[PDB]
Chain A
Amino acid sequence: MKEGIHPKLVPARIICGCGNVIETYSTKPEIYVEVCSKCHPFYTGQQRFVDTEGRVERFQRRYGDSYRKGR
């Protein structure tokens, strides 16, 4: 799983119906899409007792290196 995080684990699927709305004001929305789509995370990291990396993801990086600096 190489675009997951590490403190947690993340890579989800999608469909993306566009099309109109105008529901609660008038008629009813248009819709017309069956297009599957990617929807995804990020990379970056730090240092051990000298020498590291990390990868990780965003919110669980504020959390992340919090943790691991906490050794």
Chain B
Amino acid sequence: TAYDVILAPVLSEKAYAGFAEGKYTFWVHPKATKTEIKNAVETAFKVKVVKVNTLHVRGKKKRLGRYLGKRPDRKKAIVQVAPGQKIEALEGLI
């Protein structure tokens, strides 16, 4: 209920450059909305976010020996940090 938690981190070859300069990449709840990505980030971590970018994306093709379905609708979200400071766990991990 109306919780702060709506996200889950991306592991693109892209994303790691963003970590090289603090442009992070969370998957999010596919109905988040810029500003809420902001406050969800500030609250769930503590930084001053500047710019949030969002990015719908979706699977298709996927088969199961005989039958045919699709990977669930999905919503990527770039985000940044202003000083260049903070969130480090994410870049240290990988």
A–B contact via C-beta, under 8 angstroms:
no
